[PDB]
Design a protein around this ligand. Sequence first.
Ligand SMILES: Cc1cc2nc3c(=O)[nH]c(=O)nc-3n(C[C@H](O)[C@H](O)[C@H](O)COP(=O)(O)OP(=O)(O)OC[C@H]3O[C@@H](n4cnc5c(N)ncnc54)[C@H](O)[C@@H]3O)c2cc1C
Ligand SMILES: Cc1cc2nc3c(=O)[nH]c(=O)nc-3n(C[C@H](O)[C@H](O)[C@H](O)COP(=O)(O)OP(=O)(O)OC[C@H]3O[C@@H](n4cnc5c(N)ncnc54)[C@H](O)[C@@H]3O)c2cc1C
Ligand SMILES: Cc1cc2nc3c(=O)[nH]c(=O)nc-3n(C[C@H](O)[C@H](O)[C@H](O)COP(=O)(O)OP(=O)(O)OC[C@H]3O[C@@H](n4cnc5c(N)ncnc54)[C@H](O)[C@@H]3O)c2cc1C
Ligand SMILES: Cc1cc2nc3c(=O)[nH]c(=O)nc-3n(C[C@H](O)[C@H](O)[C@H](O)COP(=O)(O)OP(=O)(O)OC[C@H]3O[C@@H](n4cnc5c(N)ncnc54)[C@H](O)[C@@H]3O)c2cc1C
Ligand SMILES: O=C(O)CCC[N+](=O)[O-]
Ligand SMILES: O=C(O)CCC[N+](=O)[O-]
Ligand SMILES: O=C(O)CCC[N+](=O)[O-]
Ligand SMILES: O=C(O)CCC[N+](=O)[O-]
Lengths: 390, 390, 390, 390
Amino acid sequence: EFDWQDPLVLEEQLTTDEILIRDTFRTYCQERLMPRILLANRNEVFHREIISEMGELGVLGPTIKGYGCAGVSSVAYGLLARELERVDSGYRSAMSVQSSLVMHPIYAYGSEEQRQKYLPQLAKGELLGCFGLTEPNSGSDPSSMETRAHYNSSNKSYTLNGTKTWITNSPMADLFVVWARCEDGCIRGFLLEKGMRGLSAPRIQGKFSLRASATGMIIMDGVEVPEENVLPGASSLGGPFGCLNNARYGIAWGVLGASEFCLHTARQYALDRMQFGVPLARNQLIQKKLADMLTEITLGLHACLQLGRLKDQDKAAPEMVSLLKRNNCGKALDIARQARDMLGGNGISDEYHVIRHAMNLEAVNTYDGTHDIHALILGRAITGIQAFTA
Amino acid sequence: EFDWQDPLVLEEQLTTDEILIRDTFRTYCQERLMPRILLANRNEVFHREIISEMGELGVLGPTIKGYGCAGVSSVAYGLLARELERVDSGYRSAMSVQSSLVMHPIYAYGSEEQRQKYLPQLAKGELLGCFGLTEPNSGSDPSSMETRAHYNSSNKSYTLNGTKTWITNSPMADLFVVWARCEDGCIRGFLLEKGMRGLSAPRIQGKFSLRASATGMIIMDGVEVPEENVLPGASSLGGPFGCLNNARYGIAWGVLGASEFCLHTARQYALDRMQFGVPLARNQLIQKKLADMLTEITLGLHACLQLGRLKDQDKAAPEMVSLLKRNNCGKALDIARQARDMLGGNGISDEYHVIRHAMNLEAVNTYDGTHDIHALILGRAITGIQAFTA
Amino acid sequence: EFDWQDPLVLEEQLTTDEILIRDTFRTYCQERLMPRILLANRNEVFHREIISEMGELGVLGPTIKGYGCAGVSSVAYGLLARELERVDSGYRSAMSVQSSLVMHPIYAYGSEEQRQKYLPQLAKGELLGCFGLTEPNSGSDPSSMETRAHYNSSNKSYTLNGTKTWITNSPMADLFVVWARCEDGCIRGFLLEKGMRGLSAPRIQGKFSLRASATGMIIMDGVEVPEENVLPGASSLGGPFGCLNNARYGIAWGVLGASEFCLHTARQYALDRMQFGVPLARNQLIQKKLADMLTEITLGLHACLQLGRLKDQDKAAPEMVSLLKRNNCGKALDIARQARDMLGGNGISDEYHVIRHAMNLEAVNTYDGTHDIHALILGRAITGIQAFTA
Amino acid sequence: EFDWQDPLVLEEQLTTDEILIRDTFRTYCQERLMPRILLANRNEVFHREIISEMGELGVLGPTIKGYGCAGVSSVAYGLLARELERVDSGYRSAMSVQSSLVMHPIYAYGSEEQRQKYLPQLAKGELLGCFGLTEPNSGSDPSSMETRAHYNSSNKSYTLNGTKTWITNSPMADLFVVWARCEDGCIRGFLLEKGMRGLSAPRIQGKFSLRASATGMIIMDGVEVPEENVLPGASSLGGPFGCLNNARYGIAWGVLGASEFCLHTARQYALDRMQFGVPLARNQLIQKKLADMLTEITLGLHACLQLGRLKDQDKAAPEMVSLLKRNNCGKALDIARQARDMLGGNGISDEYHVIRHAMNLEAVNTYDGTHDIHALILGRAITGIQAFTA
Ligand SMILES: Cc1cc2nc3c(=O)[nH]c(=O)nc-3n(C[C@H](O)[C@H](O)[C@H](O)COP(=O)(O)OP(=O)(O)OC[C@H]3O[C@@H](n4cnc5c(N)ncnc54)[C@H](O)[C@@H]3O)c2cc1C
Ligand SMILES: Cc1cc2nc3c(=O)[nH]c(=O)nc-3n(C[C@H](O)[C@H](O)[C@H](O)COP(=O)(O)OP(=O)(O)OC[C@H]3O[C@@H](n4cnc5c(N)ncnc54)[C@H](O)[C@@H]3O)c2cc1C
Ligand SMILES: Cc1cc2nc3c(=O)[nH]c(=O)nc-3n(C[C@H](O)[C@H](O)[C@H](O)COP(=O)(O)OP(=O)(O)OC[C@H]3O[C@@H](n4cnc5c(N)ncnc54)[C@H](O)[C@@H]3O)c2cc1C
Ligand SMILES: Cc1cc2nc3c(=O)[nH]c(=O)nc-3n(C[C@H](O)[C@H](O)[C@H](O)COP(=O)(O)OP(=O)(O)OC[C@H]3O[C@@H](n4cnc5c(N)ncnc54)[C@H](O)[C@@H]3O)c2cc1C
Ligand SMILES: O=C(O)CCC[N+](=O)[O-]
Ligand SMILES: O=C(O)CCC[N+](=O)[O-]
Ligand SMILES: O=C(O)CCC[N+](=O)[O-]
Ligand SMILES: O=C(O)CCC[N+](=O)[O-]
């Protein structure tokens, strides 16, 4: 009565909707995404339409209520990210930006006029957006960004100058949610649209992680923004940090799908591939690896489930999320690399996919709070002493 | 709103009874057990009465229904083991034998007459019992034991010959649940009482793990047992293996309390102890360790909770238990050793307790299924191929 | 007086020639190789001429005496592989095949006529060769290959049928050293030249490890070979296994250069990159990583040195080599991945090179004896019991 | 031709004297020490005479030239510590204090009159000494000690006040080398003899690491010391730090013997113990562990050898020593704990010794520079930035 696929029966913890939604999306993902990832990753190609398709399914901004969004549960959101990542992290990352970094902040930090004007086209996937916070000289420490926003008392607008780098989707984005430091001192969020004079978004080359995903920069040469494009609901670092957490949530769930995919591939291979006369799966050294992969996946899953619930009850704290994101991203990296080892030579071929996952999770464990950073966050919360600096 | 003590709010997952019970026992444990462990461990002493006290609280065999037992939930059982281990593994191990290895098998594999005759005195703690399965030449492989049970057609009894070693409580036990291989081939369970001619239970010396716990052997020199002392409900290896799992459950929860105790001690020490002018807790190297300890504890807890539930629904499988026991025992070992490192020189003094825990969890990760064994169990269940032998 | 670059003074252990040679090659490597690896790796390109250049330097088959080879020391050989790998593993792998897998076997297992005819053009780099042993269904277990070699009593030749896969250089090779199982039972080595009817060497696509290196297969459709092309000095698995060890030697040294390159890049970056107002190198979490990288590199180096010496004294045993190859490849993998983490986002860009190394060492730890395999080899030698099968 | 006992042939790197000395001592150690460690450790007993015996062999202060000392090589010193630790770390620790912490500083920082007066009785083992630096509030940071030494212009002496804790041998010491902070600011070294009014050396209880070794404190209640008892050759923290390094050297070698002992015990046990019908040594999971133990031991050995040489050439730097001490102590801890796991239940019995080693190396990795501390030392030397504080 044991099911290595769902050891602790996560299924009897989901609601029939959550279940339907999961399955439904898994069908889109396997049928429409999987058949197009081998080359999308090999030749660094992001199929814009992918967003549009997700737009019809109504998977973009699924937790938001109204404005054409599903208004589904956090768990369902996690389940969704898990199916998407089971295919490719780059893909899930596009969806993540759109959902938690572009929509959610507009929805919770914007004026009603902003929401009305944008949320709908975002949900439909007519507007591909991006979250521009990171800078060449500001990564783990945002209180160090250089993008400044000056105010034109006369014209009723701000003028932004700065460079954002490593920004997902930026290259083929229509709406840009840029964060700059103002004259008052507080950093705010500005909404930018492509076509604005001064705004250019070159693409980054030589990526060897998240290749199926478009990544570029945001260069602003005196880009004039109207007052009505300022996010009226976020006067400081909490704007991005509030959203950031919503993103980390999706990531905690996500990486678990990539792990499960590596697990299932290794397990099969071990049964299918024979050496020394028998199937690899018959060796102790092979079984322990599978034992450990499954164990960490399971532990993560049920943790994620729990958090999903607490979230919907508005009882989720930033640190809780740091904990699962930090944990799940590290474990998912080992699992990938282990899987890669078990497939031997074949393992280094993208045609066996595992290599793609190892590579992708390399960035996932780096972005949205490096591994060690999340450790310090947890340590601050546990000891009460700050350990990020001197 | 983050509580490093209960990151994911395990509390809102417990029932008011489970909570009361927990607290209630924690009071007995802190008030009656803690003040007596420093020396009990230093001088290898097991305070028999400890059982009697637990007998009044009705903590022995808490899940059994009737026969004077609480008939409480599996979760409450786990919570109980967690509070006991938070003090000392040896202590929790005594309680574990009594509960899951002596009572549970009698209750589920005995005749009604056996239950009526024994369960009550066990629950009251008037009868200290022990589980004798392991032998000098049979540890991980029980299908290799040498204790044989011959049948006396004439006298209506069996004659047992064999040696069981490393048996918890045996030295001061009144009832012995011994498993021997019969003539039919199937191995059965025999009930032995002290005083039987032929039965001797010397004690083992030189233990440097689980010292506060009594450990001895079971030597049987033609010990004649009446037919009515044979466990009529277990015709083979499933008798011990069925019970074994119930024991592993308690252990999965247990080790988590020992970890939490090490965590809380290190955290404090790090805040209290200063070096280089500041509190140790101010260093990154110290914070990451605390970060990791807390993370593994939390993951385990919520997993254990889940299993506790599935158990009461009769949906718990042996492998599920192997998974948590294997996982939790390993993580709890690292956590101990880490804690020990963080207290520096003091860390090697039993007066700081951590050393005691590192030592104790050394046996916990070894007994009731070594770490690698549980790995093979999981691998068999995952690949479908046996990897214990050639 | 401490030099983090050479902690234990490996320098005062080298001979002035070994030193000259090292430096000399390091100049070719930095000047001629480094400036061409960013794209060679990005677009999977192997600059054939690279061999020719190494041919002029006389670095191909450096230990062989006569036939136009340097006849230098094993240490110098290791030093050479270390400088080459400091650039790219793919590059060093090309040189490795040529040296230890194509030349050495011809030199030690061939007739004089074979040596005279081939060694010279190989050393000059006029003949690019490859070692074909691995098969689609034979990887860790060679006693399972399917390439059969039948004998033509009439024509005085053999006919080979089989497929070799994952063969380095095969795509642009002139000489092929193929191993096939004969009718007698013993497996022998056959020399094949491009142009032979029946022999085709397609290339493998989708590599995401050792991209700057050409990898293809060896398909033989009744490829007729003259008796004079059979390696008269190797009647069984010891032919490849004898050479294999000579290859592993070079690899033990090699991976150490890739590690040092990752170390030097991280160290600099940590000093150059600032966050939170100071240089990353000022954080404890960053320093420990650097501490560990350096420690493992050093340990490996001096071990390699020692073995190099024992080798020249003909006192090197297969297991010694397994030990360093196994050890060094694993440690060099962690070091890469760590380095990659420390460079954050940039770390995922090939323009920062570390990513290339992590990827490359993924194959190095897989080929020429997987990590776990070398473990079993060591275990056999230590316990005297074979543990590869049932 | 492979010898798992000496993989890389360390033997052909030793001089016939070094070899004789090694063997000679190994005979004393096996014949006189081993038969007395089971109980010495069980009942916390230090056989004072042990020093006297080592005194006759002339093993105390072996590198010092003259004054009745051997004046042997650093390598021979390491070899000596390795044989001693192969028995018990506590034992080797006694010898270490005597040699590197009591004698060496007197010899290199004392006046000739001091050397003449003490070195001889120390070498003979007539004077058991101890190194008192650590304090209750000063462990990793010595620049924080509280023992002050005031000067009596009138009497020509100093008055010391302070407490030193965790001091090896102190309980049965005749000579005390105490370090206190003077009025000038510089910390100096004072020589104290038992019987001095004001000086008391109680013993510490509850040790569960290095039990066979005596450990106590040094309480000084206005202990008046003559000017002639001040170490004229050490005006600051470099006095202890200079000696400290000489101690770490011995430790780097030492822990390697304890590892080898655990390795040899596990290997045998694995061959001797059978489960599932065969010897444990026949399982892959068991072989990999042995593979890893041997690998780390070997790497350490040859590193230690090298350093030994550089030392005698006066080319050893503090960081080199930190590197091996840090490395070897950590690896020797894993090896112990692994060994302990492999012996299952028996493993928790001191009669199988491994448990004793795991426990002992717990303190070794803590004293003379914690693991993380040595990491920061290395990081300072590598980046040039101090990371011990804010
Ligand atoms: C595929 C990909 C897509 C991305 N998409 C986006 C996007 O859409 N929007 C956006 O805003 N950003 C994006 N980023 C960038 C990401 O948010 C930043 O990489 C991350 O917040 C910070 O790291 P960094 O690259 O600046 O490196 P750093 O901050 O310089 O850190 C480098 C290393 O130093 C360590 N470190 C840093 N500070 C400390 C400290 N105080 N103590 C100890 N260790 C420290 C880290 O743990 C890490 O190992 C993306 C990156 C990748 C790789
Ligand atoms: C404090 C303490 C109390 C105990 N109390 C009891 C009690 O009350 N009742 C009772 O019945 N027993 C008891 N035991 C013993 C316990 O149940 C046995 O130790 C355990 O089932 C088996 O291990 P073993 O000691 O026989 O060693 P082994 O079975 O010999 O195993 C030794 C090592 O070998 C490994 N190993 C074994 N087989 C294999 C394989 N096929 N493949 C790969 N690795 C393998 C293990 O992982 C372990 O590291 C106790 C032990 C301690 C230490
Ligand atoms: C870039 C690159 C270049 C190469 N170039 C060459 C070349 O020039 N010439 C040539 O002959 N070959 C070459 N190879 C292939 C290499 O020699 C083989 O990959 C290697 O010997 C065996 O692994 P495999 O790929 O067949 O996988 P497998 O043998 O199937 O092994 C797969 C996994 O199973 C494990 N495994 C296998 N058997 C056991 C067992 N009994 N017990 C426990 N675990 C086991 C391994 O540890 C590994 O993790 C190359 C590979 C790469 C990736
Ligand atoms: C059996 C035994 C014998 C001993 N014998 C002697 C003797 O003969 N003579 C003598 O002088 N001393 C002796 N000592 C003590 C030893 O020298 C000290 O334990 C050691 O120098 C320092 O640690 P501590 O105990 O004070 O703990 P601490 O210095 O308080 O350190 C505790 C923990 O904190 C960490 N830590 C400390 N500072 C930092 C920092 N800045 N950043 C990050 N982590 C940090 C450490 O890594 C360790 O894990 C002995 C100890 C034992 C256990
Ligand atoms: O780093 C960030 O600011 C968030 C990235 C979210 N994502 O999935 O790309
Ligand atoms: O090994 C066994 O058979 C069970 C031990 C249970 N316990 O807690 O001592
Ligand atoms: O696997 C092999 O047979 C050897 C590979 C050598 N190399 O460096 O590519
Ligand atoms: O910590 C110290 O000051 C040195 C200890 C040396 N030793 O072997 O006990």
